[PDB]
Amino acid sequence: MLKIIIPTTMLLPMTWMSKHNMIWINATVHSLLISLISLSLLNQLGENSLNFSLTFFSDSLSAPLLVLTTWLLPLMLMASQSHLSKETTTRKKLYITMLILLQLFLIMTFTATELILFYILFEATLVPTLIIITRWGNQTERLNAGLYFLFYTLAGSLPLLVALVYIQNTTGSLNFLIIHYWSHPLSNSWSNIFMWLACIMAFMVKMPLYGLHLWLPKAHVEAPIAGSMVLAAVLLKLGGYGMMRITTILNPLTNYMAYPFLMLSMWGMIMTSSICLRQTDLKSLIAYSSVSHMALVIVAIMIQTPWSFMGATALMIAHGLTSSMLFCLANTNYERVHSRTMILARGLQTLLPLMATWWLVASLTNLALPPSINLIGELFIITASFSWSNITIILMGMNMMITALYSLYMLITTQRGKYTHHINNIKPSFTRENALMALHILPLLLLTLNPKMILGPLY
Amino acid sequence: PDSWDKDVYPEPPRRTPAPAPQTSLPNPVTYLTKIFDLLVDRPVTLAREFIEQQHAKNRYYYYHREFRRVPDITECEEKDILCMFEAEMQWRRDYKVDQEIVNIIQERLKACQQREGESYRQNCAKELEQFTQVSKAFQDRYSDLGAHYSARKCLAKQKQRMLAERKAAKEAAAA
Amino acid sequence: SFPKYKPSRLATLPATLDPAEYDISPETRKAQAERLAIRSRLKREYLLQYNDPNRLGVIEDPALIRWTYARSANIYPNFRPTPKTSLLGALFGIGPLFFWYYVFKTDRDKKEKLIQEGKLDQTFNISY
Amino acid sequence: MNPFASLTLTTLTILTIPIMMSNSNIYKTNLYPNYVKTTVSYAFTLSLVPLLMFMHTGQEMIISNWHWMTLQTVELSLSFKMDYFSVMFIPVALFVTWSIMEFSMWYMHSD
Amino acid sequence: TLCLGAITTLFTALCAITQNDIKKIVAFSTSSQLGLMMVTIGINQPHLAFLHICMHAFFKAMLFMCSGSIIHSLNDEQDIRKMGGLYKAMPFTTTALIIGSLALTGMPYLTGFYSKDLIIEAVNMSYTNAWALLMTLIATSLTAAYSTRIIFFAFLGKPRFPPLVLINENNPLLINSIKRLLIGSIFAGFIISNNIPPMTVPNTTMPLYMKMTALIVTIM
Amino acid sequence: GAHLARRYLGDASKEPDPLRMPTFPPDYGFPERKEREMVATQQEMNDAQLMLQQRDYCAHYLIQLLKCKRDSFPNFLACKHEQHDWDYCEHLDYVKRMKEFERERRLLQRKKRREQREAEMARG
Amino acid sequence: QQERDPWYDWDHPDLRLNWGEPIHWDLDMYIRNRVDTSPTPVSWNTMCKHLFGFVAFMLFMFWVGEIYPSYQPVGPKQYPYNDLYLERGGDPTKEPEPVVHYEI
Amino acid sequence: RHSIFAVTHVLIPVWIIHYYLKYHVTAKPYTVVERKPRIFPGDTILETGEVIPLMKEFPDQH
Amino acid sequence: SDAPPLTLEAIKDRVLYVLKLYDKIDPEKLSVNSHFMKDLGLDSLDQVEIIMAMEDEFGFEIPDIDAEKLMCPQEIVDYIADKKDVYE
Amino acid sequence: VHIEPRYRQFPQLTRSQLIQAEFFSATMWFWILWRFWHDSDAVLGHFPYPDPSQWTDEELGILPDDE
Amino acid sequence: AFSAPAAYLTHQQKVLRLYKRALRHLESWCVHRDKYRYFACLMRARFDEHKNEKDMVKATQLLRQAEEEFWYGQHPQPYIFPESPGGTSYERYECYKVPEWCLDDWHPSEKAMYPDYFAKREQWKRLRRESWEREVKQLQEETPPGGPRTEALPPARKEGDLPPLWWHIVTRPRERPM
Ligand SMILES: CCCCCCCCCCCCCCCCC[C@@H](O)O[C@H](CO[C@H](O)CCCCCCCCCCCCCCC)COP(=O)(O)OCC[N+](C)(C)C
Ligand SMILES: CCCCCCCC/C=C/CCCCCCCC(=O)OC[C@H](COP(=O)(O)OCCN)OC(=O)CCCCCCC/C=C/CCCCCCCC
Ligand SMILES: CCCCCCCC/C=C\CCCCCCCC(=O)O[C@H](COC(=O)CCCCCCC/C=C/CCCCCCCC)COP(=O)(O)OCCN
Ligand SMILES: *OP(=O)(O)OCC(C)(C)[C@@H](O)C(=O)NCCC(=O)NCCSC(=O)CCCCCCCCCCC
């Protein structure tokens, strides 16, 4: 799989040796080529993984995530190259270096075949993100956002390292294959209870679970647009990947240890979804919607059925694409009016019609309109939950209605009504922004054409 | 046509009555059918025969892959990883084949229900009982394994069911 | 004469039915005068830059910034633990969780007990 | 063979052709409403034939033409039911729609 | 289903007879007809419900088109309190609206007849709720009530619209569309009900005072 | 309905129960009962695919009417005698159902009268 | 915001707000696409009484009609072959209890 | 140009759909399932050639 | 087609027509500069009634704050013309 | 066709709309009368409704209160 | 809408507003013209009866009773003009209203059509630019040091001047912009 890893490490010096006015062109072109190359991982087998070497492997769960990462980097470049125009060439190359390092760490993370290497890269992803947020953010809250993000992650991730070394000493290996084949049941013990908590809590925080989610609004709101895109699209799914990889050793304790988290994920689903109804800031609204969708994914992983796993994979991919698109759409208005308040610039459909239809399509995808992959994932999770308990349908339906309510509320507030009178600096949409929106949204529909590619290994 | 096997996708005789009109009025359906076939089916048949004779000029074959019958999870030592891997792959392939068997029976049942019209409740008894048997056996084999299923968990489920059955049978024999 | 109208929270009292408008004192009249003065000076301040040919962008509204700040970042500095806040937080944060836990635990206990004892209508339950 | 299936699917398919031509150099002219009204009228007159076939011989069909997913034992396919309800309701809806678009060509003339 | 349909049809018919916006009256009539469809579903007559759907489409759509013609002619006015004498000012619109209102009320041998009278007869001849039956009959009466409301307040009397008269319905598009739906609302019930095969057992033996229940309540 | 008025306002035990019926044996008052005759066999109704509720003792006329409808397709008014025959058979079936209801009603009438008379005799 | 004067020349006509005036804490709850507190022709606590009474009366009368059902003076409908035993599901190896209907 | 619309909007789509149904969809089992035609007493089956017997001596009570 | 492009002449003609159909105004005494309070001796209620009459005639409503200070037919025609963007 | 506003006069009509409206109203009424002439039973009923209280105790099969 | 409001409404203003509202709701109740005329003359007489009263306290008390009666007898669904703030066509054409400054963002190929229109637009922009400073100066002269007491604006007092703060009033989009 080094045929994908090495070209990114070559993106590094090509960026650092390109001339001052062609960094963006070269980065975009070669990132798109790398995504085309990584598209070859979708040819997955039906029984086992693709064991490239002793250190790297791929199955049908990590291949869509890798494709999403490689595809997201060019979108991040295109959206970033607007607000960094006045920046010096050295710091622009530094920003591109941060993005490239993030993509490389994610690529190795999604394919590491043993748990300690996966942990090392999963934590290494923190440094470029923190630097991006706290160096290229706009307001003075970026420092606190970075602190919250970093310490929320590490507080949950250090016990995971302790538990991982404990497991390796007790069993002898941490390779995913050996771990799966030699799996043994976990007894109902206090020691096993705390081992379960240590193995689960890092990925709980990374989702984030409701209650441990207070870092996400700060981090996603204070970050630059590329940081927000990478946080919402990919970095939230590391928790889901780790959860669905490490739950193979936590049975049968999960059957009764998932009871609290499930509740926190279900009721929390409602609570965050209600917060979006009263958000005066667009970015915070998008962040809280991300929290609710991730709560649904947590339920899917915790109930641990094949339909739930397929739904979780589909929902992870669909939410990544949708949230990235929503953040980019909000950023266009932000660069227009330099304010994040939703009611400031109103009636934008009159002045930006094509951007208005992008807004409509993004909102329709967000509220899970059939036959999008968003709906496929949500519906599979809902059916799995109904099999788990028939009373869950009440909470799921409440969440569906509130999701539609706040999605269309945001669309109506920003796009419809009458324009604000004094705002006269709304220029026509650039080709770059429309191309960015189209490149976000076309893969979503092309994927609902062939959904088995994002349904995971349980398919 | 012969593109599939009639024994696995069995169909009825398809007896159709003969047209016996009681009235001398022209039948619009027959005239519309004649116009349709002349204007549509003839060009479609011509194009298909042209494409078929093009395909006949370059004919190649593809084959169905054959798999051996390696030892199963019951013939593997506790920590032998090669035998475990072989048995696990074989079990997963068998699981896929069983899924397709259930799919075939479900297709049979759906086709029977659509074909039989208003008599489906009585005329689709054999298909319903076939589906009941097949689904019962599939549920006995693979249900409740969850995600992270394997040959070992299936074997443990089978062993537990067999232990319960043996205990019940010996209790009954104790009467 | 006629049955009265009883106002409430979601159906307020009309102005023409409000006795506060039919008993006017000079203090209220000068209060209305200064209210109109404040409104008029704000309107002038807005209109002076609204009609400026050389202005390009967004006219900053301090009221909007004050509102968003008060609704977002000014809440915690002004929060104080009190019996009201403590009880409300405990209730609205823990009660729903325990209620849903009890409901789901009871439902799943019933389902599992029925499954072990041997009747749940599990026929055709292949997909789970 | 059996024009029932072909005609029933064609009635549904031809309605999408104006949506395909929503980007051509007809959506920007004033001939587009007449184009859509004509398409709906043609769809109605085409759907009148399967209705005749049902009224004659009571013909009913199901057409599973495209297979989408197979999860484990649940196969999801693009399947159309062409029983009495569908073949009777489709022409009525097409007729009502034809009349309403003809009316809208006058009601919304200034839009 | 039966109770839901009965309460819906009666409630919406009750709300309709005091409305002054013409579109609102037609909308509440639509809701009442949908309630009647749920009632006939609740008595195990799905095919009658589908038949009623197919017939109701015709005259309800053309009634809305007539309302739109009136609204466009009277300078975008929808309140019936400002629609005066249009019986002579709009002859085609008034004849189409009268025919639609008669088909809606179940006047014999019209499209509404072959569905609504059969639905009422089946409801009268079933082991059903007593309250649902009574609500259905009262809704059948209120249908004629609000049809009378529309016709009386929009077409009879003296003008109540602004003096600048723009009344002009001489456009082939409007005339042809309404004419097609009018031919439908006259002949479609007879054509359709005589061609579909019998999918249910009829009610061939019922008391004379009960065979006329729909007509009687409509007249009252 | 008047029967509803009598049942829900008068002596309900003196009126038949529509759900629980018949209460008396079919030969309680009939010296000789003749079994009802079915004209169409099971296979014919199955092949005609009539319906699960149209397969009553009048299904032969329905089969004839369906055949006449299918055979004379373009002229949809050419089946009036068959339609009338099916309606008349259904009407006769409804008359028999009404006769059964009335017979059960007056059998309960006689049973109540006989019980009260026997109780009166027991009073002496 | 619906209670605001619709004829005053607001700086934001749809929102009905002027530049610089204090904004209500719950403005986004009163944006007039949402919760409306305008006075009503009928007093609150009178509309509630009427609506609750209507709904409760309908529920009670529906239950009453349920336990006093309407029907016709007819006997149960009869079906020829043991009430269509073979066609209503089947089980053709049982020979169930005969269901015979006699002439009347 | 007199009747181009019918050729381009009806004939071509029906050709494509008829091809796709006759040679691709119907190539697989059970993709197209029709309701069994009704059989009445007195008809003759086209293939078998048998004749269904008449329906048992109507009492003819008119 | 919708209503024709109403002009200044039509507005003035129709306002004067409506005012001439008023039984409290002498038709030959009424001109287009004629003040309602002075040149015709009407009171506030009459002016309110005239305003409602013009509202009913022209199909739109003049708010009370604006209507109370229209005391000449020329003022009314100017207000109506300004509302409908009549420039000819 | 061009029709002008009239300002408090009855609107100018056309012979076409008048004859069309009259033709369709006449068509409706003719259809109603013709159908009632041919298919009156669909409104008035066809088969007689029997009276149960007239039936004799013998055809209902009940003994005269003997046993 | 076009008139600067005052700090309060006088008793005569309130009486006239109640009179207009009562007449409108009465017309809503009496749909026919002759019946409305009869009851409107009765209402006019009822208003005329107390117009001569000199005691202001009992006058405002009678106004209060009048207000209470109106609320009780008001129409639940009064007639609203289509373009009125409650009508069925209130804000129907706001989606077609485009501000004029949008024309500054047009492509040169777009401005190639309508050359005369953009020449006139350049004239208007130049006029606004030359008049702005005089408008600001005039507005600065006429207001008290404590700020304006009302939102009424003054006119131009010189031959070459323009009424201050005129651009957005004059360049309204239209009532039917499309
Ligand atoms: C903001 C949100 C963050 C995430 C929150 C995560 C929640 C984590 C909680 C995990 C739930 C399970 C933990 C304990 C397992 C059993 C539950 C408890 O009731 O134990 C009972 C025992 O009774 C008592 O409860 C024992 C525990 C008493 C002390 C625990 C109370 C702690 C208070 C909660 C603190 C809030 C969590 C956050 C801390 C910062 C069960 O009785 P028994 O069947 O015999 O024991 C089964 C376990 N055995 C077999 C291993 C022995
Ligand atoms: C089935 C599970 C859920 C059941 C329903 C429970 C209620 C759910 C809570 C509703 C959440 C609403 C908050 C967010 C909505 C946004 C605010 C909003 O939309 O504004 C209100 C807006 C404005 O009102 P207008 O009359 O149009 O005024 C226009 C002129 N001024 O109107 C609305 O949208 C109000 C809709 C609220 C619906 C709540 C009532 C629903 C109750 C249903 C009970 C009946 C169940 C049916 C049983 C059927 C039998 C099987
Ligand atoms: C954003 C904030 C997130 C906070 C997450 C941090 C808490 C995560 C849960 C606790 C993790 C600690 C687990 C320790 C490592 C696990 C290794 C293990 O399980 O081995 C056990 C050892 O188990 C332990 O010793 C666990 C001791 C725990 C001490 C640390 C206390 C930390 C706080 C405890 C309460 C809070 C936990 C949940 C909080 C959730 C966050 C709100 C067996 O060892 P033996 O001694 O050999 O026993 C078998 C032979 N007799
Ligand atoms: O400036 P002018 O035009 O001359 O105004 C004259 C004015 C009346 C202002 C003047 O004479 C004056 O100041 N009068 C003082 C007393 C006064 O007018 N008090 C108010 C009388 S209230 C009244 O009685 C009205 C009765 C009707 C109330 C409505 C009830 C019906 C509503 C139901 C609608 C269906």
Q: Do D71 and A451 touch (CB under 8 A)?
A: no
Question: Which residues lie with the beta carbon below 6 Å from any ligand 1 atom?
Answer: A 188-190, 193, 211-212, 257, 260, 264
Pick the residue from chain H with its C-alpha nearest to B44.
H19
State yes or no: is I78 an active-site residue. no
Residues after which chain J has a gap (C–N > 2.5 Å)? none
Q: How many residues does chain B have?
A: 175
Chains that touch J (3 or more CB pairs under 8 A): E, F, G
CB contact (8 A) between residue C126 and residue D71? no
Ligand 2: centre distance to CA A399 (Å): 15
SS3 (DSSP) at E165:
coil
CB A276 within 8 A of CB A288: yes
DSSP-derived letter for residue A249 is G
Atom of ligand 2 nearest to the CA of G32: 31
Bridge partners for D76 per DSSP: D69
Q: What does residue C71 show for φ and ψ, rounded to 5 degrees? A: -85, -15
CA B107 distance to own-chain centroid: 6
Residues G90, B119: C-beta atoms closer than 8 Å:
no
Contact K79, K160 (CB under 8 A): no
B44 φ/ψ angles, rounded to the nearest 5 degrees: -65, -45
Q: State if residue A199 touches ligand 3 by the CB under 6 angstroms criterion.
A: no
Evaluate whether A54 touches A113 at the Cβ level (below 8 Å).
yes
Question: How many residues are recorded in chain I?
Answer: 88
Phi-psi region of C121 (alpha: psi -120 to 50; beta: other; left: phi over 0): left
At CA K12, angle to CA K9 and CA K13, rounded to 5? 40
Gap between the Cα atoms of K163 and K155, Å rounded:
5
> Could you tell me if E167 and J14 are in contact, meaning their C-beta atoms sit under 8 angstroms apart?
no
Alpha carbons D110 and G89: distance in angstroms, whole number: 62
Closest Cβ–Cβ partner in E125, E126, E129 for G66: E129
Nearest to A418 among G14, G29, G33 (CB): G14
Q: Considering every ligand atom, which ligand is closest to the CA of I50?
A: 4
| DSSP letter, residue D65 | E
Which ligand is nearest the CA of A158, by number?
3
Chain G positions touching J61 (Cβ under 8 A) are 104
**Contact (Cβ atoms closer than 8 angstroms) between residue A317 and residue A453:** no
At J57, give phi and psi (nearest 5°).
-65, -15
Beta bridge partner(s), residue G17: G12
- Phi and psi (nearest 5°) for D62? -130, 135
Distance CA(F37)–CA(A242), nearest Å, equals: 74
Touching check for E173 and chain J: CB below 8 Å? Answer: no
Q: Is the CB of K14 under 6 A from ligand 4?
A: no
With CB atoms and an 8 Å threshold, state whether I45 touches K24: no
Q: Name the residue ranges covered by the structural domains of chain I.
A: 8-84
Round to whole Å and give the CA distance between A376 and I9: 65
Gyration radius of chain H's alpha carbons: 22
Residue A313: burial class (beta carbons within 10 Å; 0-12, 13-18, 19+): buried
Q: What is the CATH number of domain I8-84?
A: 1.10.1200.10
- Cβ(B2)–Cβ(H27) below 8 Å: no
Q: Which of E166, E171, E154 is nearest to E76 (CA)?
A: E166
Whether residue B119 lies within 8 A of chain G, CB to CB, comes out as yes
Burial of E68 (0-12, 13-18, 19+ CB in 10 A): buried
Contact state of B3 with H45 under an 8 Å Cβ cutoff: no
Pocket probe for ligand 2: among G34, G38, G40, the residue whose CB has the most ligand atoms within 8 Å is: G34
A350 → closest Cβ in K91, K95, K168? K95
Residues 6+ apart with CB under 8 A from D49: B32, D3, D7
Cα distances (angstroms) measured from residue I12 to each of I19, I23, I30, I67, I69: 11, 19, 13, 17, 18
- Measured in whole angstroms, the distance separating CA A62 from the mean position of its chain's CA atoms is 13
- Does the N-terminal peptide bond of residue F31 adopt cis geometry, omega within 30 degrees of 0? no
Question: Residue I45's CB: how many other CB atoms inside 10 A?
Answer: 17
What would the two tokens of residue A219 be? Answer: 């981090």
Nearest residue to G40 (alpha-carbon basis) of K80, K78, C10, K87: C10
Pocket lined around ligand 2, Cβ cut-off 6 Å? A 397, 405; E 4; G 34, 36
Rounded CA separation C48/C40 (Å): 12
* Mutant choice from E77, E81, E82 vs K, greatest count of K C-beta within 10 A: E81
Q: Peptide bond preceding A252: is omega within 30 degrees of 0, i.e. cis? A: yes
Whether A139 has its CB under 8 Å from any CB of chain C: the answer is: no
C-alpha of residue A190 to centroid of ligand 1, in Å: 9
Q: Facing residues of D69 across strands?
A: D76
Sign for the pseudo-dihedral over CA of B45, B51, B53, B59:
negative
**Residue K122 in tokens:** 């350049």
State which H helix or E strand residue H32 sits in.
Answer: strand H32-34
Out of F28, F91, F99, the one facing J55 most closely (by C-beta) is F99
At B106, the amino acid letter reads Q
Task: List C-alpha distances in Å: I64 to C128, K1, K19, K46.
Answer: 69, 9, 11, 21
Cβ atoms within 10 A of the Cβ of E48, count? 23
Given K32, K33, K79, which is nearest E79 (Cβ)?
A: K79
**Dist. CA A193 → ligand 3 center (Å):** 8
Pairwise CA distance, residues J6 & J1, whole Å: 16
**In terms of Cα–Cα distance, which of A19, A69, A50 is closest to A317?**
A69
**Per-residue 3-state assignment (H helix, E strand, C coil) for A319-337:** HHHHHHHHHHHHHHHHHHH
Give dist(CA K75, CA D105) in Å, integer.
Answer: 37
Question: Of the ligands numbered here, which is closest to the C-alpha atom of K62?
Answer: 4
Q: Tell me which amino acid residue E86 is.
A: L
How many degrees, rounded to 5, is the angle at CA E4 between CA G73 and CA E208? 30
Which ligand neighbours the alpha carbon of A260 most closely?
Answer: 1
Q: Which two tokens stand for residue B87?
A: 């048995």
b/e per residue B129-143 (b: at least 16 CB within 10 A) = eebeebbeebbeebe
CB B105 within 8 A of CB B134: yes
The dihedrals phi and psi of H32, each to the nearest 5 degrees, come to -115, 115
Task: State the burial class of residue I56 (Cβ atoms within 10 Å of its Cβ: 0-12, 13-18, 19+).
Answer: middle
Subunits adjacent to chain K (3 or more Cβ pairs under 8 Å): A, C, E, G, I
- Tell me how far apart the alpha carbons of residues C57 and A194 are, in angstroms, rounded to a whole number: 57
Query: CB of C128 within 8 Å of any CB in chain B?
Result: yes
Quick one: angle between helices A353-366 and A306-337, nearest 10? Answer: 150
Give the residues across from D62 on adjacent strands. Answer: D81, H33
Distance CA K113, CA C21 (A): 58
- The preferred substitution site among A157, A158, A194 for testing ligand 3, maximizing ligand atoms within 8 Å of CB, is A194
Which listed residue (I2, I26, I39, I43) is catalytic? I43
- Phi/psi of residue D48, each to 5°? -65, -20
Residue of B nearest to A255 (CA): B146
Cα K132 to the center of its chain, rounded Å:
26
Residue A458: both structure tokens together? 């349980």
For residue E155, what are the CA distances in angstroms to A436, E75, E83, H6, J29? 57, 16, 7, 43, 20
| Ligand 1 atom, smallest distance to A261 CA | 6
CA A417 → CA A281, A409, B37, F87, distances in Å? 18, 12, 55, 62
Instruction: Kindly give the distance from the C-alpha atom of residue G50 to the centroid of ligand 1, in angstroms, as a whole number.
Output: 51
Alpha carbon distances (Å) from A137 to A133, A143, A290, C73: 5, 9, 20, 18
Helix E46-73 × helix E91-104 angle, to 10°:
160
Rounded to whole angstroms, the Cα distance separating D28 from J50 reads 71
Torsion angle of alpha carbons A183, A185, A191, A197, nearest 10°?
70
CA A35 from chain centre, in angstroms, equals: 17
K73 Cα to the center of ligand 4, angstroms: 17
In terms of CA atoms, which chain G residue is nearest residue F30? G104
Please answer whether residues A419 and A282 qualify as being in contact, where contact means their C-beta atoms are separated by less than 8 angstroms.
no
The answer for I 3-42 residues in CB contact with K (under 8 A) is: none
Where does residue F69 fall: left (phi above 0), alpha (psi -120 to 50 degrees), or beta otherwise? alpha
CB neighbourhood size of A302 (10 A): 22
First to last CA, chain B: 58
What number of C-beta contacts closer than 8 Å exist between C and G?
63
Which residues from A are below 8 Å from K90, CB to CB?
Answer: none
What is the three-class DSSP state of K127? helix
